[PDB]
Amino acid sequence: PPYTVVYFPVRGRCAALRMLLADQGQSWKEEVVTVETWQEGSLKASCLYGQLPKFQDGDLTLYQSNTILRHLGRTLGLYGKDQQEAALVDMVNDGVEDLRCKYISLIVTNYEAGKDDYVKALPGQLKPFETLLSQNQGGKTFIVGDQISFADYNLLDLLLIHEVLAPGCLDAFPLLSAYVGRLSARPKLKAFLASPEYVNLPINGNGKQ
Amino acid sequence: PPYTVVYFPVRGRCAALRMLLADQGQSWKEEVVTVETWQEGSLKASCLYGQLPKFQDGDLTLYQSNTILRHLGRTLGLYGKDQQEAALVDMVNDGVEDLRCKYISLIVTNYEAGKDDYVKALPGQLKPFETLLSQNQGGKTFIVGDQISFADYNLLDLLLIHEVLAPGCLDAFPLLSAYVGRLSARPKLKAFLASPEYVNLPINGNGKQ
Numbered sequence: 001p002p003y004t005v006v007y008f009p010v011r012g013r014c015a016a017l018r019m020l021l022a023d024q025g026q027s028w029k030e031e032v033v034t035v036e037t038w039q040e041g042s043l044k045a046s047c048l049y050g051q052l053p054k055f056q057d058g059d060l061t062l063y064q065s066n067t068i069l070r071h072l073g074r075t076l077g078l079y080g081k082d083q084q085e086a087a088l089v090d091m092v093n094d095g096v097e098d099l100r101c102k103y104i105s106l107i108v109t110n111y112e113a114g115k116d117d118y119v120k121a122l123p124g125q126l127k128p129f130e131t132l133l134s135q136n137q138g139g140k141t142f143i144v145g146d147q148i149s150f151a152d153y154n155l156l157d158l159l160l161i162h163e164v165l166a167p168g169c170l171d172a173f174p175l176l177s178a179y180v181g182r183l184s185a186r187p188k189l190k191a192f193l194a195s196p197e198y199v200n201l202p203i204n205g206n207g208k209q
Numbered sequence: 210p211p212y213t214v215v216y217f218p219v220r221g222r223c224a225a226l227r228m229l230l231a232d233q234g235q236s237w238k239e240e241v242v243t244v245e246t247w248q249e250g251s252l253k254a255s256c257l258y259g260q261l262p263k264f265q266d267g268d269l270t271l272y273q274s275n276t277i278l279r280h281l282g283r284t285l286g287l288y289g290k291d292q293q294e295a296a297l298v299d300m301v302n303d304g305v306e307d308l309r310c311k312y313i314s315l316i317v318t319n320y321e322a323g324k325d326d327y328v329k330a331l332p333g334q335l336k337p338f339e340t341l342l343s344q345n346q347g348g349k350t351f352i353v354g355d356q357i358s359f360a361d362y363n364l365l366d367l368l369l370i371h372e373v374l375a376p377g378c379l380d381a382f383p384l385l386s387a388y389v390g391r392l393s394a395r396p397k398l399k400a401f402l403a404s405p406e407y408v409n410l411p412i413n414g415n416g417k418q
């Protein structure tokens with residue numbers, strides 16, 4: 001620290017890392033980039049891959065939302081107990097990323113025509129995470145092992161936004177459903193999720209969810 | 210170990226982890242899945258996310274190409290010298306993955322109509338990695354720090370397939386151009402890249418490159 005998040009005024013790809021920081025009792029600054037500022041081009045030209053989020057951790061500048069999550073995971077001890085658990089954490093996170101990419105593609109490029117197909121496909125996309133829970137202490141703790149990892153925050157966000165996209169998509173998955181409630185009830189995360197800094201942001205940039 | 214790679218008969222998303230293993234003096238088994246076996250459904254239904262590669266490391270079963278890379282990076286010590294370098298390695302790898310996804314989309318969904326636009330955009334997509342090299346010991350070592358990392362193998366693969374797609378795309382990037390020659394000349398990697406194991410597989414599954 002100090003931590004600074006540089007992003008558009010949306011939840012988007014910063015939603016998980018923010019929940020992680022909040023739940024872990026961390027402070028951070030939000031630096032907001034508007035569409036009009038971004039379009040000027042100067043900040044963009046300055047970004048490693050021409051994209052946001054950009055994250056500052058003291059004198060470390062990072063790009064890439066999953067790099068930020070892994071960095072915070074490593075430095076705050078949210079990466080499993082073992083090298084083997086570490087591997088499982090990554091496997092979960094990469095799964096979350098794949099589905100997030102499909103979600104973003106729908107939202108940004110094909111919402112109206114694509115939604116029906118996406119929703120029909122959704123149970124089979126959610127099922128792997130229910131299966132992972134079923135294989136770890138009866139679904140009663142976390143996605144990997146017996147402590148929270150960065151993948152938990154990422155998966156929680158993915159599940160939250162899919163309940164907005166498709167209300168009741170978790171009803172067929174008792175472990176995922178209970179998991180969402182149990183993690184959302186963690187006191188620091190509960191407060192953050194109720195706070196204007198979360199509540200008063202849209203999920204995406206184009207008005208769709 | 211022992212290591213097993215379960216994949217289609219292509220370089221694809223196993224190309225980097227295979228270079229990594231060969232370069233590190235590791236042996237592994239290739240278990241080949243044909244289009245016909247895959248279409249039968251049994252193996253696919255058994256895969257965590259319904260996809261390949263699948264990787265065995267002794268009694269550990271992994272899915273997700275970047276999970277496998279990070280696992281090998283972690284267990285073989287190809288993950289930077291400290292936590293800050295680990296973050297930089299992830300940042301590189303996540304950048305490589307974004308471009309790989311764009312490349313795969315071109316190849317699979319839009320080769321004929323998309324190639325011109327893709328190739329025009331290519332220098333802007335390659336420049337960040339030239340910049341990273343320029344910022345690390347004048348480009349003379351590795352993408353991050355002074356030791357090879359899993360992201361080096363993934364980046365080298367990305368550069369190799371783009372030279373096939375767009376011959377001469379690296380001519381404007383002297384550090385990237387030299388980096389490709391230098392890593393490819395590493396003795397164990399050199400031998401692997403010249404071997405039937407590599408040479409006799411197509412890059413992708415649809416006859417395009």
Ligand SMILES: N[C@H](CCC(=O)N[C@@H](CS)C(=O)NCC(=O)O)C(=O)O
Nearest residue numbers: 012013050051052053064065066307
């Ligand atoms: N690989 C992604 C990239 C982030 C990304 O897609 N950024 C978008 C908003 S979430 C963006 O900056 N688009 C603006 C532009 O490309 O000009 C990550 O995980 O951070």
Ligand SMILES: N[C@H](CCC(=O)N[C@@H](CS)C(=O)NCC(=O)O)C(=O)O
Nearest residue numbers: 098221222259260261262273274275
């Ligand atoms: N997230 C990817 C996914 C792998 C993937 O897209 N697999 C393709 C071949 S490279 C596949 O198994 N397609 C068959 C199918 O979906 O049925 C990874 O990094 O491993």
Ligand SMILES: C=C(CC)C(=O)c1ccc(OCC(=O)O)c(Cl)c1Cl
Nearest residue numbers: 008010012013035038039104204205
């Ligand atoms: C957040 C996104 C997906 C999670 C995204 O793709 C995105 C892209 C461009 C954006 O504006 C900048 C512009 O000039 O359009 C905004 Cl606000 C967003 Cl949210």
Ligand SMILES: C=C(CC)C(=O)c1ccc(OCC(=O)O)c(Cl)c1Cl
Nearest residue numbers: 217219221244247248313316413414
């Ligand atoms: C990444 C890929 C290549 C650029 C890819 O998606 C892919 C998908 C299906 C495939 O066949 C199996 C089948 O019958 O679907 C194969 Cl061989 C590949 Cl390589």
Ligand SMILES: [Ca+2]
Nearest residue numbers: 027028029030
């Ligand atoms: Ca704050």
Ligand SMILES: [Ca+2]
Nearest residue numbers: 076077078147
């Ligand atoms: Ca912990």
Ligand SMILES: [Ca+2]
Nearest residue numbers: 170171172177
């Ligand atoms: Ca319910």
Ligand SMILES: [Ca+2]
Nearest residue numbers: 168170171172
């Ligand atoms: Ca029901």
Ligand SMILES: [Ca+2]
Nearest residue numbers: 285286287356
């Ligand atoms: Ca090393």
Ligand SMILES: [Ca+2]
Nearest residue numbers: 379380381386
């Ligand atoms: Ca040249």
